[PDB]
């Protein structure tokens, strides 16, 4: 003779997809976006996680693309530059690159409808396509928009926070490989501080593994999938563009300005990155040991050069570097440094789209940055692995793999011995 009793505030939940909002630790595009300023252990909860079927990654990806476009939307367009250029090579003080820099002159608009001006600027070879008669790339598909020089795209930590009624569960299993049950689950309000760093092949400034190198994949036997390798120790990489650049601001219209690369002071030298050699050899040895566990006890593993996918492709100081990683991925496993040459581009077709293009104003001075390699993206009777990637969602999966969003459903019933009357 038991009766139905209704309980509200019950600790029960279901998997869910919702809208997360961004918080931050209190100009920069994310600082403006992440307007909200900024852990409970569940003693006997086992929960199932799956980083490959997550929604947080899709939502983060969407927010980044959207914010990026919003940032460029109000900036001056460079459609006045889709004219024929007269380009010759820069020959002064060139070390040995040769055809990388060109001195281009052209007929451009002015603030008056009835007046024209002759200007010149330097361009990188990769941004200019030959028809001495040249034009900028694109100008056929997409218009080029100049990024505002006052807007910062420096990544800052982003904290995704649950809306009321929802919670984020975090997996603390030290060796969690992205899927399946996790026995160390805690509840959090915000997903830690994650930096939206954009690169391919080598993932910079992410989280480190705590005990060993961890290799994660959707299907380890499916050669079509990317393998995300999380390192337990970082590898330091020192990148620079040694040339002393200047900038010329050209009025192109009524309050509209174009930023052109001006004369380079001193020698023209190649941009490059210095990877510590001993650290790199130890790093791969650890990766290989963990790979052998999946590819065979006596399987020989070799690394090889890949075939804006084959390059590192990262944003350093605001410039876009396309470094040659073939200097790293070349070995067989059964004070020195590795110098990787880097190409520089100003016209960027970002996020694998072609209907839009950005022009990055040149940055004056000399640029240097030092970054932490925290993980690798690899693609697959010996085995050979190559760098891969380019799909940005796979970078974000490396930081959000331990989080899951659930909906709280605090209402239910159970039998007991009381009657209402």
């Amino acid at each position: 003779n038991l009766w139905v009793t209704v309980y509200y505030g019950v600790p029960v939940w279901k998997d869910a997809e919702t809208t997360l909002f961004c918080a931050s630790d209190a100009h920069n595009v994310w600082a403006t976006h992440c307007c909200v300023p900024t852990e409970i252990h569940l003693e006997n909860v086992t929960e199932e996680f799956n980083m490959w079927k997550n929604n947080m990654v899709e939502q983060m990806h969407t927010d980044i693309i959207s914010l990026w476009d919003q940032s460029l939307k109000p900036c001056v367009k460079l459609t006045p530059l889709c004219v024929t250029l007269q380009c010759t090579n820069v020959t002064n003080n060139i070390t040995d690159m040769r055809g990388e820099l060109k001195n281009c002159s052209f007929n451009m608009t002015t603030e008056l409808r009835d007046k024209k001006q002759k200007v010149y600027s330097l361009f990188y070879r990769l941004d200019v396509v030959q028809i001495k008669e040249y034009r900028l790339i694109n100008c056929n598909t997409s218009a080029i928009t100049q990024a505002c020089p006052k807007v910062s795209f420096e990544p800052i930590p982003i904290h995704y926070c649950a809306p009321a009624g929802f919670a984020i569960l975090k997996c603390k299993d030290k060796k969690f490989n992205g899927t399946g049950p996790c026995t160390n689950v805690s509840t959090v309000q915000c997903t830690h501080g994650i930096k939206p760093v954009v690169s391919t092949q080598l993932l910079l400034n992410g989280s480190l593994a705590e005990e060993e190198v961890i290799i994660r994949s959707e299907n380890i036997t499916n050669n079509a999938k990317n393998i995300l390798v999380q390192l337990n120790e970082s590898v330091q990489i020192n990148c620079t563009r040694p040339n002393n650049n200047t900038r010329k601001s050209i009025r192109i219209g009524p309050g509209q300005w174009f930023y052109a690369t001006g004369d380079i002071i001193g020698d023209i030298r190649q941009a490059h990155c210095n990877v510590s050699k001993a650290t790199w050899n130890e790093t791969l040895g650890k990766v290989v040991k963990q790979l052998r566990k999946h590819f065979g006890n006596n399987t020989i593993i070799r690394f090889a050069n890949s075939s804006e996918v084959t390059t590192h492709s990262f944003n350093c100081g605001g410039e876009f570097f396309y470094c040659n990683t073939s200097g790293l991925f070349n070995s067989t496993w059964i004070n020195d440094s590795i110098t990787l040459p880097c190409r520089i581009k100003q016209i960027i077709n970002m996020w694998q789209r072609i209907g839009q293009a950005m022009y990055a104003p040149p940055i004056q001075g000399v640029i240097r940055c030092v970054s932490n390699i925290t993980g690798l993206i690899l693609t697959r009777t010996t085995e050979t692995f190559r760098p891969g990637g380019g799909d940005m969602r796979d970078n974000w999966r490396s930081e959000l793999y331990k989080y899951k969003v659930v909906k709280i459903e605090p209402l239910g019933v159970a039998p007991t011995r009381c009657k209402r009357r």
């Binding site: 939940w13 909002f21 006997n44 709280i408 605090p410």
Partner: protein
């Protein structure tokens, strides 16, 4: 908040003020989040009200428990199982129970209206 989630039902029932007081609090994403929290809150509070449990975290009803829904005794339900487990065990009977609770309240209210007529 959910700290009691791994505990048995008989333990977790004492932490219901928590996850009650914690359920309500580019652009329009924030309005959508605020509106959703409010709409969900009200659907649950109004559902308790239609069953005659407004203002309570724990309410007794006049609907008997059917052994079909669950044939376990109170010792197993309250001391061995947790709330996530219980919810799964009777998930397919929830709608039946809710309909019965609404029917029961409708009858109770009419009966009280008549007693108050004396």
């Amino acid at each position: 908040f959910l700290g009691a989630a791994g505990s048995t039902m008989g333990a977790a029932s004492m932490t219901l003020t928590v996850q009650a007081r914690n359920l309500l609090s580019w652009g329009i994403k924030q309005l959508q989040a605020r509106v959703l929290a409010v709409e969900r809150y009200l659907r649950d509070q109004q559902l308790l009200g239609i069953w005659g449990c407004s203002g309570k975290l724990i309410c007794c009803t006049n609907v008997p428990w059917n052994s079909t829904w669950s044939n376990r005794n109170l010792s197993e339900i309250w001391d061995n199982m947790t709330w996530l487990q219980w919810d799964k065990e009777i998930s397919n009977y929830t709608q039946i129970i809710y309909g019965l609770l609404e029917e029961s309240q409708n009858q109770q209210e009419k009966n009280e209206q008549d007693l108050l007529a004396l």
